[PDB]
Amino acid sequence: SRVGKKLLEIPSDVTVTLNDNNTVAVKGPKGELTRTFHPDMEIKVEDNVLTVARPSDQKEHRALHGTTRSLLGNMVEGVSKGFERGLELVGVGYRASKSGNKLVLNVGYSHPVEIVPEEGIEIEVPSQTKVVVKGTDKERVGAIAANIRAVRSPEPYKGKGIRYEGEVVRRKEGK
Amino acid sequence: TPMANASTIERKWLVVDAAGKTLGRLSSEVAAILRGKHKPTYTPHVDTGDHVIIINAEKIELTGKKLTDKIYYRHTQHPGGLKSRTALEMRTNYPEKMLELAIKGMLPKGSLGRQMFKKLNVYRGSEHPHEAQKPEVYELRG
Amino acid sequence: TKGILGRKIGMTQVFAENGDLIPVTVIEAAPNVVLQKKTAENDGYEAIQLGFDDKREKLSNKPEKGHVAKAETAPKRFVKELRGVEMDAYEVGQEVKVEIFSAGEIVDVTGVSKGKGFQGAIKRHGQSRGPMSHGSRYHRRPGSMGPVDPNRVFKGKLLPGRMGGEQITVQNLEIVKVDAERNLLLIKGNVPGAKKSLITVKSAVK
Amino acid sequence: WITRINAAARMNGLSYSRLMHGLKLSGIEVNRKMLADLAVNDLTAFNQLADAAKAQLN
Amino acid sequence: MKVRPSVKPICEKCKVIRRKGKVMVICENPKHKQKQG
RNA sequence: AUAAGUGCUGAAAGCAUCUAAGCAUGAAGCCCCCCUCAAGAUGAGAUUUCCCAUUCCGCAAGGAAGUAAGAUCCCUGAAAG
RNA sequence: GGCACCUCGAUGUCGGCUCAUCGCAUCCUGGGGCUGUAGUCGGUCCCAAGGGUUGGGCUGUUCGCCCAUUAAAGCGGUACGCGAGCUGGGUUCAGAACGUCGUGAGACAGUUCGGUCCCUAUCCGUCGCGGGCGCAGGAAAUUUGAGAGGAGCUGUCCUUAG
């Protein structure tokens, strides 16, 4: 019941580095990432070990200790394996397709809708009625996923547009 | 009887960095220096003040949530339309106006008040237009 | 952007090679000359100062004579400057002529408007006037000043005064025809300013 | 007079109120505001009083 | 959204939450979410 | 750049969480882009060019008296009044 | 409405015309939550004061009802905005009349016909236009832009698409 206390790992040559002022930078097999933190939390680089300690004990310090631990763990896992979010649209004629690095969607809108990934995020069209986004970092991947969902969030009558994986959707009778 | 000095003023030129000192205290003290209250031979109608130069006004800082809360109102006397801008603005494009208005409020109001205000100079960056006055850096007290 | 400096000669109409009929304003612009290439590094901004019409030596004072000496041309009666143009595109002292424009281009035109002298409120701001009958002694007066509580009259109430003589802009005019041999421009529609006044022509910003 | 005395004191590491307190405890300084300003414009004397006041203040 | 100065948990599934100085209730039932003031 | 709204990440408080640390998006609204005025902006700004730094007096504080460039008076007028 | 505090050595009262200008507790337009929101159309609530927010019949009337529209035909403050700006149709004078009350002179928030609306702008203020001086020489032009002002509203139809 204290996330900020537990420890992180360095599974396989996951180069964890500490910069000048509580700022970090990791170069895993998937890629490279960086992050900066306020100086209160003391993160120490150790061989298969890295510390997470807060000087004092009170509201803001506790919250930020928990967050920095969770962020470090999430980022190291992401740069180790890379992470993806699944979007499985539904529609009678709704279409998902590739246009090179760019992505184009066909939905009940009279014109097509385009998307331009740029942050090292990569999307795939594994099937006509399913689109999966891959990327190193959870924040950016989820941001792109929500961006796609905003193109057409589903309706509660028939269900349409974009759907996150296993995303239950409210059902309303259509009479 | 006390000596009401006049035509015996020697105005020093002072420099201060406002990068790390809050504008409130900075203004409240620099107003006194600009008025010359710090001089031992102060008089109330002769403007014994001292020229000052502000530096790095853009790096001034505000306490609390003032950076979005403090409103810099202004009313042109044209019909009932106001013009307003927040505090964090003017860091962007013209921070000398913040300091000028603050000091303007600080100093006494009057003709001699404007005369005292005349000796203030505020700039962005960390370079004076002028070095011929042999200005000397003067950190604050409070 | 592009533009030239010219004089308004008159107004007429022209057929467009379709059956339709076009009203058109006729502008003459003898080849302008660039006098000074205002540049950012010294003048704070980029622009070109150019002059259009000539002056006799009797009227050309020595200052403007020496000023134009760099361009090496006759002293220019009217001078104006344009912003947003490419400095490198124009040598100082080169001519502009009128072929820079061409038929079909969209154009914005500006110039001083016709003077009209001390005019009343109705003629000036076009607000209705009191009844002409039923004993109304309020024929052509400018309305009440304002409420009582403010104990004054606000700024910006519309009252009689002078009219005309302020530069105005008309947006999205079309260049119907151009005649380089005469140094002539033909703008669709109508343009501010009296006859033989100065008109300036600029590529539309929109 | 108070303003001038305050300026003179502040230019010697001492606030006006502490200066007056220190003077009073250092002795009955029947010497007062106006002539203290005359000492200020003869500042060396004013410093020669301020040092005594500071020394006796602690 | 209901904007009522009195904010209550309408159904147990509702949960009260403190955001941007103003309390709200989040419930998967969208019919219940509300903000005070 | 924001309002309401929708959010991604994420603890406080192993969960959850649009939040406290971060990152977004988002109105005929706000600040510009459009048009006009604007250096009396006494903070009187800048650029291009012309005149040159004479004669008199206390020699000098500084005065006066002809001029340089350029204007004015006066006169013919209006596209202005 | 209660009170009588300023004004009875006089502060002009309803409605309309002219001119506006402000608040937002929003009538339309813009952006959203929920809906017993299938869709066109709606109801409720949140942000939103930029702009717009109609012509006639009746009545002195505002207010109302009605006709025809528009996206809508907002609610209020400004001495129930505005008479040294106008109007005088009504209340609020003197004439006369009907009903009623009064023995009577006469009286009616009962009615009806008629019934003098003064002023050369001194100072602020507002809209325009001049002269003087300053801008540590004197001139002729071109300009930067602090900072002000204006606009900043919308329908219909074809297509997408039956």
Nucleotide closest to residue C156 (CA–C1') = G126
Contacts of C152 in chain B (CB under 8 A): none
CA of B102 to C1' of F40 (A): 25
Query: Distance between CA atoms of B51 and B134, rounded to whole angstroms?
Result: 12
- For strands B13-17 and B51-55, give the pairing: parallel
The one-letter amino acid at C141: R
Residues 6+ apart with CB under 8 A from A117: A101, A102, A103, A123, A133, A144
On whether any CB of chain B is under 8 Å from the CB of D49, the answer is no
At position D55, the amino acid (one-letter code) is A
Cβ atoms of residues C136 and C198 within 8 Å: no
Residues of C in contact with B81 (CB under 8 A): none
Q: Which residues pair with B84 in a beta bridge?
A: B73
Query: Pick from B117, B67, B57, B115: which is nearest to B88 by CA?
Result: B67
CB B136 within 8 A of CB B113: no
Neighbouring residues of D4: CB distance < 8 A, sequence distance ≥ 6: B2, B40, B41, B42, D37, D40
Judged by C1' against the alpha carbon of C81, the nearest nucleotide is: G142
**HSE on the CB side for A3, CA within 13 Å?**
13
Distance C87 CA to G142 C1' (A): 17
What is the edge-to-edge ordering of all strands in the sheet holding A83-87?
A83-87, A130-135, A122-127
Q: By CA distance, what is B42's nearest residue in D?
A: D4
Both structure tokens of C84:
């947003």
Is D35 at the interface with chain B, CB within 8 A?
Answer: no
- Measured CA to CA, the distance from residue C197 to residue A132 in angstroms comes to 68
Length of chain D: 58
The DSSP string of C189-205 is S--SS-TT-EEEEEE--
Residue of B nearest to C153 (CA): B79
Contacts of A160 (CB under 8 A, 6+ apart): A90, A91, A94, A108, A152, A154
Q: Is there contact between B and C if contact means ≥3 C-beta pairs under 8 Å?
A: yes
| CA E25/CA E33 separation, integer angstroms | 5
- Cβ of B42 within 8 Å of Cβ of D3? The answer is yes
Cβ-Cβ contacts under 8 Å between B and D: the total is: 25
Find which nucleotide's C1' atom is closest to A140's CA. F8
CB B12 within 8 A of CB B51: yes
Q: Which residues of B touch D (CB under 8 A)?
A: 2-3, 37-42
Distance of alpha carbon E2 from alpha carbon B95, whole angstroms = 43
Report the distance separating Cα C81 and Cα C48, nearest Å.
5
Q: How far from the centroid of its chain's Cα atoms is residue B1's Cα? A: 34
Chain D: nearest CA to B113, how far in angstroms?
18
* Whether the Cβ atoms of residue B142 and residue B25 lie closer than 8 Å to each other: yes
Q: What is the largest CA-CA distance in chain C?
A: 71
Structural contact between residues C95 and C31, judged by C-beta atoms closer than 8 angstroms: yes
Residues C115 and C163: their CA atoms lie apart, in Å, by: 6
Cα distances (angstroms) measured from residue C138 to each of A140, B112, C129 = 72, 52, 8
Which amino acid appears at position A44 of this protein?
K
Nearest C-alpha of chain B: how many angstroms from D6? 8
Residue B142 in contact with partner chain C when CB distance is under 8 A: no
**Partners of residue D10 in chain B, C-beta under 8 Å:** 38
CB within 8 Å: D7 and B39: yes
H/E run at residue D5: helix D2-10
Cα–Cα separations (whole angstroms), residue C46 to C13, C39, C41, C42: 38, 4, 9, 9
Task: Report the candidate in B12, B48, B20, B11 with the shortest Cα–Cα distance to residue B139.
Answer: B20
Q: CA-CA distance, C123 to C113, in Å (whole number)?
A: 16
Nearest to B39 by CA among D46, D45, D14, D5: D5
Residue A156 CA distance to nucleotide F21 C1' (Å): 36
Coil, helix or strand at residue B13 = strand
Angle at which helices D33-41 and D43-57 cross, to 10°: 120
Phi, psi of A35 (to 5 degrees): -165, 145
How far is it, in rounded angstroms, from Cα D28 to Cα D33? 14
Q: Which residue is nearest to nucleotide F18 (CA to C1')?
A: E19
Measured distance between the N- and C-terminal CA atoms of chain E, rounded to whole angstroms: 12
Distances (CA, A) of B44 to B90, B116, B118, D11, D43: 34, 11, 17, 19, 20
Spatial contact of C198 and C108, defined as CB atoms under 8 Å apart: no
Q: Are C190 and C25 in contact (CB under 8 A)?
A: yes
DSSP letters of A2-71?
Answer: -TTTS-----SS-EEEE-SSSEEEEE-SS-EEEEE--TTSB--EETTEE--B-SS-SHHHHHHHHHHHHH
* Angle at alpha carbon of residue C183, lines to C177 and C186, rounded to 5°: 25
Q: Does C154 touch chain B (CB under 8 A)?
A: yes
Q: How many CB pairs under 8 A join B and C?
A: 7
For D36, other C-beta atoms within 10 Å of its C-beta total 22
The C-alpha atoms of residue B60 and residue B91 are separated, in whole angstroms, by 8
SS3 content of chain B, % helix, strand, coil (to 5): 25, 15, 55
- Cβ partners under 8 Å of residue C21, min gap 6: C13, C14, C15
Task: Give the nearest nucleotide to C163, CA to C1'.
Answer: G128
For chain D, the first-to-last Cα distance in angstroms comes to 26
Q: Where are the alpha helices (DSSP H) in chain B?
A: 23-35, 66-69, 96-106, 111-117
Q: Which nucleotide is nearest to E18 (CA to C1')?
A: F19
Per-residue flag: C115 CB under 7 A of strand F: yes
Question: Alpha helices, DSSP H only, in C24-171?
Answer: 40-43, 62-69, 121-125
Resolution reached, in Å? 3.4
Closest by CA to A52, choosing from A81, A72, A78, is A72
Q: What are chain B's partners, defined as 3 or more CB pairs within 8 angstroms?
A: C, D
**Residue B8 burial class via C-beta count within 10 angstroms: exposed 0-12, middle 13-18, buried 19 and up:** exposed
Q: Using an 8 Å Cβ cutoff, are A33 and A78 in contact? A: yes
**What's the angle, vertex CA D17, arms to CA D11 and CA D21, rounded to 5?**
115
CA distances from residue A53 to A1, A16, A23, A68, A154 in whole angstroms, order as listed:
15, 17, 15, 10, 44
Rounded Cα distance between C60 and C53, Å, is 12
Could you tell me if B78 lies within 8 Å of chain C, comparing CB atoms?
yes
From which experimental method does this structure derive?
A: cryo-EM
Closest CA to A24 of A6, A7, A39, A13: A39
Amino acid at position E33, single letter: K
